[PDB]
Amino acid sequence: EPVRLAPEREFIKSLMAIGKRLATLPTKEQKTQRLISELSLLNHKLPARVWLPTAGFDHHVVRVPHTQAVVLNSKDKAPYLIYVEVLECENFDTTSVPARIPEEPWQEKVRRIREGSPYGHLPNWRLLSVIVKCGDDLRQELLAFQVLKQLQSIWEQERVPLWIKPYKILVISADSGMIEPVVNAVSIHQVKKQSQLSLLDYFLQEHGSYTTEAFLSAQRNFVQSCAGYCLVCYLLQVKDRHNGNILLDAEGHIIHIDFGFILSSSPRNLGFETSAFKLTTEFVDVMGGLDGDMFNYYKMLMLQGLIAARKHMDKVVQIVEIMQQGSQLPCFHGSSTIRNLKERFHMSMTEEQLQLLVEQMVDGSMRSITTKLYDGFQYLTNGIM
């Protein structure tokens, strides 16, 4: 029997249809209750010869634990997060559909679902997640995803140990799609709110003291991820960066999410910023302060990462142009979007000039640091300090 597409279509469309019925309800509480009923229905039809395209490995969907889903706000087109149980197979075109079996860290959720699930005992059992957004255009997020993948490939090609975490995007319709969330990480906001610690203090408690391998490793990951996302934010002009859309994983990396405002997305800021990526006192303290080795490493990585990116600029630029041809999104605004993008690769600069540029940009990213208001007055008065 050949792989049929109608089952998959109807599966994807059922997840979308569920959102339309959620949209009829005013409050999260009510949407949540509705969602539980909806997912129960879904399981009548499972297991089936259907898949989550975001898995990136062959598998069949066996179960959607109806109690574990989450509505994410009270908006008219409110997204919802589902957990989806699958059984991995090697060969999908030749594997038959699994037989049915009768009836807050990620790690905890994986544990509780596995124990409640009739399939949880299977060695090929895997839990995936998706956020279904049945009334949002994700083509900009998809563009970002594509650019991030390309930069990752570039940095690997050029042996630059920058670290980012692209997260998978599916564009369904013009104003609908799905996202695989980054699961093994919590927002900085929440890390701070719960622990009531500074990031430095959190690392010292969570990983270890200054002389521990664990601290040094976490610090390295933080620096490598900060540098990666600094270049991402600059090249793509990602806006709206706050502690709610920066996550921290258990290894010490940061992960930026929600690339809503990118490139020429309105509104433009009026504060002469090079980037919306800002390097706070808290961040710098993690890196051992302004004259730390790890801060110097951060600036070296930014230089090498930018050297690498411009060496392969066309690969990045093509992705953007293809998207711009294919559709007219908010992030585009005629020829200038591409022009401005190309200029941010600084093709005309020598490496000495790039290094001076990186010092300037890094200094720029720290403008909001309180010390900077204190010790900047030589630029605003005839005093030399």
The binding site for Mg ion (CB under 5 A) comprises: 378
d(CA 115, CA 112): 5
CA torsion, points 294, 295, 298, 302, in degrees to nearest 10? -160
Please, which residue, 5 or 380, has the CB nearer to Mg ion?
Answer: 380
**CB of residue 375 to Mg ion, shortest distance in Å:** 12
Please, which residue, 73 or 378, has the CB nearer to Mg ion?
Answer: 378
Amino acid, res. 19 = G
**CB of residue 379 to Mg ion, shortest distance in Å:** 6
**CB of residue 360 to Mg ion, shortest distance in Å:** 18
Contact 310, 347 (CB under 8 A): yes
The label of the residue with tokens 């190309």 reads 342
**CB of residue 56 to Mg ion, shortest distance in Å:** 56
d(CA 167, CA 343): 27
Please, which residue, 350 or 381, has the CB nearer to Mg ion?
Answer: 381
Please, which residue, 328 or 382, has the CB nearer to Mg ion?
Answer: 382
Please, which residue, 40 or 378, has the CB nearer to Mg ion?
Answer: 378
Distance set, CA 286 to CA 95, 102, 198, 216, 279 (Å): 49, 51, 9, 10, 11
* Residue 281: partners with Cβ closer than 8 Å, 6 or more residues away: 369, 370, 371
Please, which residue, 37 or 378, has the CB nearer to Mg ion?
Answer: 378
d(CA 315, CA 130): 29
Long-range contacts at 213-221 (CB < 8 A, ≥ 24 apart): 217/251, 217/252, 218/251, 218/252, 219/252, 219/286, 219/287, 219/288, 219/294, 220/252, 220/294, 220/297, 221/163, 221/251, 221/252, 221/253
**CB of residue 383 to Mg ion, shortest distance in Å:** 5
Residue least distant from Mg ion (Cβ): 378
**CB of residue 377 to Mg ion, shortest distance in Å:** 7
d(CA 383, CA 385): 5
**CB of residue 372 to Mg ion, shortest distance in Å:** 15
- Spacing of C-alpha 85 from chain mean position: 22
**CB of residue 373 to Mg ion, shortest distance in Å:** 15
Please, which residue, 103 or 379, has the CB nearer to Mg ion?
Answer: 379
Please, which residue, 353 or 378, has the CB nearer to Mg ion?
Answer: 378
